[PDB]
């Protein structure tokens with residue numbers, strides 16, 4: 144059987160995670176704010192990829208840390224057309240990166256909503272997310288998770304996925320055992336909730 148990567152799709156509410164997940168799986172669909180999560184599976188090269196699309200609202204965000212132990216990598220989505228929110232997206236990513244289970248895991252950052260006239264380029268989003276100081280491998284890809292009526296999805300989305308998967312693939316020998324071990328350790332400690 145094939146190797147399995149697990150990925151968390153994170154970013155602030157309204158960034159476009161759920162739409163991006165849909166579009167990456169080939170399906171235009173309607174979306175409402177995620178007050179929980181969506182979960183699906185993708186094929187990319189030699190890997191089966193489990194993707195967890197978590198809600199980004201301020202009252203859902205605390206859930207993210209419950210996944211970081213079982214994840215090999217992150218897709219972080221930013222609404223590139225809303226610089227008003229760059230600073231909270233920066234603080235939100237910082238929190239994820241500070242987390243103990245994030246060390247050495249790669250981040251694919253999608254600068255989403257490039258169809259909007261105010262969309263910031265990759266450079267701007269690097270500044271805005273304060274990535275100059277980030278020491279998790281990362282790359283920023285502009286994209287449009289919501290292409291118009293009738294258009295093909297944006298190839299930039301798979302490009303970003305392929306960079307992520309290739310980065311995980313390159314370290315898989317060290318990363319996967321750590322994920323498996325770290326994940327079970329956390330899964331073990333949540334058996335507690337009876338007491």
Ligand SMILES: Nc1nc2c(ncn2[C@@H]2O[C@H](COP(=O)(O)OP(=O)(O)NP(=O)(O)O)[C@@H](O)[C@H]2O)c(=O)[nH]1
Pocket residue numbers: 154155156157158159160161162163174175176177178197198199200255256257258259286287288289290
């Ligand atoms: N113009 C434009 N709008 C987009 C794009 N991507 C998503 N949207 C829109 O942005 C809004 C939020 O998208 P959605 O994927 O639900 O956001 P989300 O990150 O899952 N929000 P939450 O974290 O609360 O579930 C929706 O109206 C959606 O159609 C895009 O590339 N361009």
Ligand SMILES: [Mg+2]
Pocket residue numbers: 160161162175176177196197198199
């Ligand atoms: Mg959503």
